[PDB]
Design a protein around this ligand. Structure first.
Ligand SMILES: *[C@@H]1O[C@H](CO)[C@@H](O)[C@H](O)[C@H]1NC(C)=O
Lengths: 170, 107, 49, 170, 170
């Protein structure tokens, strides 16, 4: 999707308290916040895959060979043919199941990144523009208490609507 | 003023695999193929016997070594490298077949 | 307590695979050729610039 | 993709005549329409997967055991080993093929939802803004006959271009 | 994703020197350029899949049958059962691995197409609008030397910022 390792240049090693977080700046300073939903929905998926593969089987199988009193040779080259070909199958699915469930895991991080980005893109509405590295250039005044209203999705667009439409075109 | 979005990342990482590339670094990884071997044989909640020098077919003829497993009651069987079905030399005919049935006979 | 065995001891694992003994017998994970395969329980990592 | 169960709050139980539909409002009223292409392209995919799995095989296999006059025991524990391990394989692929073809089915509904949404976003061009729940806030006059021109993709952007650029900034 | 065979009407048979390319127009003329990264990142993926399947196996298997001095019949119908069922498995994975690695290949062309399109959408910033067929309608003057600055990502948005915000609203 282009988010992680696309147009965001990088990630933030200080964000202990989430996978995903906020980081703003105004006339006060800079602070590194976090986002619970976006972090938590992703945690729900990594451990969902986990709870699948733990599901084992209820089919039991007996020891059919013998490594003390050995069985016959014309049959060993057939059992060592079926077993050494079942070995080659589950070594193919673990080659494919493990290779895929990891392939499908990183992309759940670019769709949870275009889902937090195209939402703040809709609360702000027609009040900010996007520069390049993945930020929203605010041209009005928004302090520590105003930013936290975009965080918990209580920000109102018609509340600062006429200021940013007067500092963006000018 | 300016507001931003970002993701988590580190530099003490492992490496994993996908469908197009091989060797990519990630956040937190997990193993899927087992490599750790408990060397003992775990037996709880099930009755068990061990033959050692007795062979599995030794409980059926009963050489001077399997005299307590003439009637052995068990949910589990262990076979050893010194199991001998015979004291007067010989060999059964279709012997291994009898083990697999006896492997699952419960006594 | 266990539910999977081979000639060298017991294989206790929640994992679906194992690279240990092909003649392991019981209620087991599947045998596989590679020694280890890693599933990422995390997101992608871009080392901070 | 975020469409279904993301920023659209829900679906419309009245839309019998499609998977996807329209629902507008103006100085006339409200009406629930439908969209044929977006519904039909999705129908083409659900029944494509269907026509695959119906493809059966032309390889025949014989009864190799016997449940009347039973065969030998050292061989039953090997055939019941190969068969009870083939059972465990196709019970793994049906665990994986069925689990995946369903996983891949719902996502064909979020990409057919961002494909109808980013298109009406281009016919209207610079004449409407997006509020939050998944609608286009129209600030000009568009009636029952005007809406149906955005439906069949004959709406012209330079036809109402100066009105909405005069009621949006004000 | 909608890019290839969605809202782009088609592709360009003249673009020998890439998978992806540019094509512009101004007071000078029209020219067909190319984009190295977008073409090259896609080449990296098609041949990555390639280098996987070339990885063969180091497990050897012996000839267990005989087509000169034939073996027994009760066993042929069991080996021809295991082998003719392994045949049916790898004919299922080649039915699934080959069917999927191709399914996953075309979609790496719609995400490398929304990744070159939503980037030029950010260099130009608030200086161009998107018409319908997949172009950016420029309302200012941008010649052969100006276009090549959007190509190599050295175009500056505050360099032509006041001209296009004066010819777009008017
Ligand atoms: C990493 O994943 C493992 C297994 O899922 C888990 O036990 C551990 O807590 C995780 N580490 C972090 C930092 O989340």
């Amino acid at each position: 999707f282009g988010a992680i390792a696309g147009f965001i240049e990088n990630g933030w090693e200080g964000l202990i308290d989430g996978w995903y977080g906020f980081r703003h700046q105004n006339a006060q300073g800079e602070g590194t916040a976090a986002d619970y939903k976006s972090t938590q929905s992703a945690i729900d998926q990594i451990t969902g895959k986990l709870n699948r593969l733990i599901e084992k089987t209820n089919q039991q199988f007996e020891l059919i060979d013998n490594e003390f009193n050995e069985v016959e040779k014309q049959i060993g080259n057939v059992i060592n043919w079926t077993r050494d070909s079942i070995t080659e199958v589950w070594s193919y699915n673990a080659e494919l199941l493990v290779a895929m469930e990891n392939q499908h895991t990183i992309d759940l991080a670019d769709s949870e990144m275009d889902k937090l980005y195209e939402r703040v893109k809709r609360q702000l509405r027609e009040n900010a523009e996007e520069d390049g590295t993945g930020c929203f250039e605010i041209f009005h005044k928004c302090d520590d208490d105003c930013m936290a209203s975009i965080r918990n999705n209580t920000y109102d667009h018609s509340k600062y609507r006429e200021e940013a439409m007067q500092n963006r075109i000018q | 003023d300016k507001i931003c979005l970002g993701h988590h990342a580190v530099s003490n990482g492992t490496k994993v695999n996908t469908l197009t590339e091989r060797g990519v670094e990630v956040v937190n990884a997990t193993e899927t193929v087992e490599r750790t071997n408990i060397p003992r044989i775990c037996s709880k909640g099930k009755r068990t016997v061990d033959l050692g020098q007795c062979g599995l077919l030794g409980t059926i003829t009963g050489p001077p070594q399997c005299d307590q497993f003439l009637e052995f009651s068990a949910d589990l069987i262990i076979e050893r490298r010194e199991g001998s079905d015979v004291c007067y030399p010989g060999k059964f005919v279709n012997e291994e077949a009898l083990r697999q049935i006896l492997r699952e006979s419960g006594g | 307590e266990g539910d999977c065995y081979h000639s060298g001891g017991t294989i206790i694992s929640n994992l679906p695979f194992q690279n240990i003994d092909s003649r392991a017998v019981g209620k087991c994970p599947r045998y596989v050729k590679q020694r280890s395969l890693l599933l990422a329980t995390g997101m992608k990592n871009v080392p901070e610039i």
